[PDB]
Design a protein around this ligand. Structure first.
Ligand SMILES: [Mg+2]
Ligand SMILES: [Mg+2]
Ligand SMILES: [Mg+2]
Ligand SMILES: [Mg+2]
Ligand SMILES: [Mg+2]
Ligand SMILES: [Mg+2]
Ligand SMILES: [Mg+2]
Ligand SMILES: [Mg+2]
Ligand SMILES: [Mg+2]
Ligand SMILES: [Mg+2]
Ligand SMILES: [Mg+2]
Ligand SMILES: [Mg+2]
Ligand SMILES: [Mg+2]
Ligand SMILES: [Mg+2]
Ligand SMILES: [Mg+2]
Ligand SMILES: [Mg+2]
Ligand SMILES: [Mg+2]
Ligand SMILES: [Mg+2]
Ligand SMILES: [Mg+2]
Ligand SMILES: [Mg+2]
Ligand SMILES: [Mg+2]
Ligand SMILES: [Mg+2]
Ligand SMILES: [Mg+2]
Ligand SMILES: [Mg+2]
Ligand SMILES: [Mg+2]
Ligand SMILES: [Mg+2]
Ligand SMILES: [Mg+2]
Ligand SMILES: [Mg+2]
Ligand SMILES: [Mg+2]
Ligand SMILES: [Mg+2]
Ligand SMILES: [Mg+2]
Ligand SMILES: [Mg+2]
Ligand SMILES: [Mg+2]
Ligand SMILES: [Mg+2]
Ligand SMILES: [Mg+2]
Ligand SMILES: [Mg+2]
Ligand SMILES: [Mg+2]
Ligand SMILES: [Mg+2]
Lengths: 101, 116, 87, 70
RNA sequence: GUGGGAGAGGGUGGUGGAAUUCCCGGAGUAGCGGUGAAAUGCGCAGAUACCGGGAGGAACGCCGAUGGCGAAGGCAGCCACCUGGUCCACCCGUGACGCUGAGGCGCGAAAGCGUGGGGAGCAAACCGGAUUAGAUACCCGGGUAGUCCACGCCCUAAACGAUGCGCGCUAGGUCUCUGGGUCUCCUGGGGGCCGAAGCUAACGCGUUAAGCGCGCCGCCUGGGGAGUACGGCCGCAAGGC
């Protein structure tokens, strides 16, 4: 198992009934693929640099997990299924390379 | 018949012609002119004189609909691309800002033999 | 790929003695595993040619060490091949 | 002119999510600045380029912008 | 072996924005386009220019380099999986296991061929407009094969460093990529430039040798005829050795 980072951006127009559903759906998808969640950072409303899905903003999520490597692309396929889900970028974790140290 | 009094002005300047359109803040055009709309027919259209008169014809046409404030957009390189701007500031239309939005691809389409 | 967990498992099995990492038997065992990792990678991905070149160099090196073991001590050569199912 | 690394703190070159610092390395347009203007090294610029492209896909950094001048 | 390192190395899937074309709508009149000037062309069935929405294919701006990787061909968005090569530090293990390499086998830009797709832009042939003494051309408007994908052929090249491979040896200076180090620098492995000795017909090469040596393969023996004829092998053909 290697350690990855999941970036999820979805429609920033949801109420709490739809927001809890979409995120608890993301929980259910990670459970089925065996993602041990190490930590979570939720930024939420953020000004985008260009219109995405005609919408000038986005609601941001970030998960750091440890999972089997062979199942990563199928996990990415499962997250983009939801209409409210717009951006899914999975990057393998790396060391914080410093500059001007 | 519209009374917009403010809007955008696009300058499409090529090496063979310079053409000016004037629109409302939403992008929908009001009036327009070009090097061919005025008397010039051939290669005289891509000249700075033609670019000047074309800018001033559309400016006076926009006076009819009551334009005062103008935001300027510029696309393309060509003779009279600067002469059209200079003619627009002194046209009576108070120029609000000037932006260069010339489209540059990310190397996606093969150009004609002329451009390679 | 090939993790150090699987790596040490092989070296300790084919070592002539504890602490031996470079015996001819050890290198051939190690070479043979990477052969089988690549030969299954090339069943699929038949159009991966630049990886196919690396496999030819591994076979050449494996057949080089085996041709050597043959000359010096032919018994350990038979015990090795029978244990790896080659030739 | 000053250079970007010269006027900056100790920052993570691999973090694609820090827009406040990555905005410094973009020009007036969305373009990536050359090494002469960023003051970075060879290995540093190659890492910055890939992390800027990452932020661009997350909608955080712009691909291109509009020049207000001329 | 162990532990680290860089990278458009390769294959598979996925994915992002800019731009071109086309469609839908809004708005909006009289031309756009193109050239040394022009005309064919397109436009009142409403184009060009502007805003919005949509579809499709191909290529990846800045970063970008005189850079990096690969045996060569060659490889530039981003993400993930599979995966090859190579380099450095430790001085641990095996104990000459090495070098080259006629055949053989595999790879091999583009173009071309077969089957089925795909088809935005570009564009042989071709259709036109000009130029011209003439235009079977350079310039302009259109446009099919093709370029793209899958699978199988084709095996050519200024396939170039016009320099086969491996090793040892022979002043340095300077720029650089990437490692390690007691980190003005020292020390490796690549990529450039000046230049000692020496070589070379000269231009020039010069620790990345075209120097001094050694090992092995390939190849040369005046030009035209001619990479032609014949024969053979290969190929569906074009045609190749
Ligand atoms: Mg979706
Ligand atoms: Mg003209
Ligand atoms: Mg690659
Ligand atoms: Mg690839
Ligand atoms: Mg329409
Ligand atoms: Mg007509
Ligand atoms: Mg008509
Ligand atoms: Mg008609
Ligand atoms: Mg179509
Ligand atoms: Mg460049
Ligand atoms: Mg190299
Ligand atoms: Mg690797
Ligand atoms: Mg020793
Ligand atoms: Mg001993
Ligand atoms: Mg060899
Ligand atoms: Mg051979
Ligand atoms: Mg070929
Ligand atoms: Mg081809
Ligand atoms: Mg074909
Ligand atoms: Mg064309
Ligand atoms: Mg043509
Ligand atoms: Mg003549
Ligand atoms: Mg004629
Ligand atoms: Mg067509
Ligand atoms: Mg020689
Ligand atoms: Mg250092
Ligand atoms: Mg060197
Ligand atoms: Mg001399
Ligand atoms: Mg020299
Ligand atoms: Mg030498
Ligand atoms: Mg000579
Ligand atoms: Mg010959
Ligand atoms: Mg003769
Ligand atoms: Mg021939
Ligand atoms: Mg004969
Ligand atoms: Mg014959
Ligand atoms: Mg035959
Ligand atoms: Mg021929």
């Amino acid at each position: 198992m290697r350690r990855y980072e999941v970036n999820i951006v979805l429609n920033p127009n949801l109420d709490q009934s739809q927001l809890a559903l979409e995120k608890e759906i993301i929980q259910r998808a990670l459970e089925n693929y065996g993602a041990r969640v190490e930590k979570v950072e939720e930024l939420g409303l953020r000004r985008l640099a260009y219109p995405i899905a005609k919408d000038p903003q986005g609601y941001f999520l970030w998960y750091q997990v440890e999972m089997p490597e062979d199942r990563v692309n199928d996990l990415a396929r499962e997250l983009r299924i939801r209409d409210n889900v717009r951006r899914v970028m999975v990057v393998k974790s790396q060391e914080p390379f410093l500059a001007n140290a | 018949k519209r009374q917009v009094a403010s809007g955008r002005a696009y300058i499409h300047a090529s090496y063979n012609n310079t053409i000016v359109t004037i629109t409302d803040p939403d992008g929908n055009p009001i009036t327009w002119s070009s090097g061919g709309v005025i008397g010039y027919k051939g290669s005289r259209k891509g000249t700075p004189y033609a670019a000047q008169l074309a800018a001033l014809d559309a400016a006076k046409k926009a006076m009819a609909y009551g334009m005062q404030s103008v935001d300027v957009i510029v696309r393309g390189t060509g003779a009279g691309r600067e002469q059209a701007i200079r003619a627009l500031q002194a046209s009576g239309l108070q120029v609000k800002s000037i932006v260069d939005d010339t489209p540059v691809p990310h190397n996606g389409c093969r150009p004609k033999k002329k451009f390679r | 790929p090939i993790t150090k967990e699987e790596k040490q498992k092989v070296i300790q099995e084919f070592a002539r003695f504890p602490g031996d990492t470079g015996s001819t038997e050890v290198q051939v065992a190690l070479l043979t595993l990477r052969i089988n990792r690549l030969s299954e990678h090339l069943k699929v991905h038949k159009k991966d040619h630049h990886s196919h070149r690396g496999l030819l160099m591994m076979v050449g090196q494996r057949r080089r060490l085996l041709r050597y073991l043959q000359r010096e001590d032919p018994e350990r050569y038979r015990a090795l091949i029978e244990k790896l199912g080659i030739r | 002119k000053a250079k970007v690394k010269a006027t900056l703190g100790e920052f993570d070159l691999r973090d694609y999510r820090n827009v406040e610092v990555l905005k410094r390395f973009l020009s007036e347009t969305g373009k990536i600045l050359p090494r002469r203007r960023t003051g970075l090294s060879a290995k540093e610029q190659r890492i910055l380029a890939k992390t800027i492209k990452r932020a661009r896909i997350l909608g955080l950094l712009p691909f291109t912008e509009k020049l207000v001048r001329k």
